[PDB]
Ligand binder design. Sequence first.
Ligand SMILES: *[C@@H]1O[C@H](CO)[C@@H](O)[C@H](O)[C@H]1NC(C)=O
Ligand SMILES: [Cl-]
Ligand SMILES: [Cl-]
Ligand SMILES: [Cl-]
Ligand SMILES: [Cl-]
Ligand SMILES: [Cl-]
Ligand SMILES: [Cl-]
Ligand SMILES: [Cl-]
Ligand SMILES: [Cl-]
Ligand SMILES: [Cl-]
Ligand SMILES: [Cl-]
Ligand SMILES: [Cl-]
Ligand SMILES: [Cl-]
Ligand SMILES: [Cl-]
Ligand SMILES: [Cu+2]
Length: 235
Amino acid sequence: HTLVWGVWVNGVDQGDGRNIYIRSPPNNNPVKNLTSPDMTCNVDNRVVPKSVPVNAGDTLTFEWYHNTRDDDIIASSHHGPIAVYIAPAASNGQGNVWVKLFEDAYNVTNSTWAVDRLITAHGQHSVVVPHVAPGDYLFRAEIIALHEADSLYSQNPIRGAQFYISCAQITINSSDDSTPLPAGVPFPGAYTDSTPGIQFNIYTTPATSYVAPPPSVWSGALGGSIAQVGDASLE
Ligand SMILES: *[C@@H]1O[C@H](CO)[C@@H](O)[C@H](O)[C@H]1NC(C)=O
Ligand SMILES: [Cl-]
Ligand SMILES: [Cl-]
Ligand SMILES: [Cl-]
Ligand SMILES: [Cl-]
Ligand SMILES: [Cl-]
Ligand SMILES: [Cl-]
Ligand SMILES: [Cl-]
Ligand SMILES: [Cl-]
Ligand SMILES: [Cl-]
Ligand SMILES: [Cl-]
Ligand SMILES: [Cl-]
Ligand SMILES: [Cl-]
Ligand SMILES: [Cl-]
Ligand SMILES: [Cu+2]
């Protein structure tokens, strides 16, 4: 159970984004139904009043929390990967529009899932804003918690992969548009019962054999990290 508080741009807190520039759901409950429209931007997908301005090459940091800002972030049980996708805002997240900018599943060196490193990072993970056309975009941050993913939700609705999905409204002001955004995947629809990384037993299978769901990261993406950029306790 986890939610996005807001974003930072180049290490500068943009302030409380909840129902302002984040299409916030009412609570921190997971989505589990792979075919539901809730897979797009969670259960309350509507236009919110503001869009954070960035430029191509800026560092955009998402900040997650559990109950209050900079708390335990997410329960330690919730091992799993983190991805970030982008789509043109005009789409409203419908159609074949989502392009993957970032993927982190399991780091063999540190023996940590992306979620474990997100806790250590005070809920902060970043992407570098790609060189797409100037305009309005939705950035979709997705955590998959795998602690009950040995079962499929479609077969047993009390278990299944848990999806924590947040969509931020971002406006790209300056960009040279050197990497125009290609077509992407649909949410719902990219993930099915047979997609790799949706059904997995973290208790009995070694993390080193985990494969994150496709699509692969777009070659136009400029990277990202799971790492604290700012200290929320100074604001
Ligand atoms: C999943 O959501 C879809 C689309 O709204 C709906 O048809 C179906 O009843 C749900 N599946 C389960 C397993 O609850
Ligand atoms: Cl929880
Ligand atoms: Cl509810
Ligand atoms: Cl659901
Ligand atoms: Cl605005
Ligand atoms: Cl726990
Ligand atoms: Cl540029
Ligand atoms: Cl579907
Ligand atoms: Cl498995
Ligand atoms: Cl992977
Ligand atoms: Cl590509
Ligand atoms: Cl980064
Ligand atoms: Cl860190
Ligand atoms: Cl700081
Ligand atoms: Cu939870």
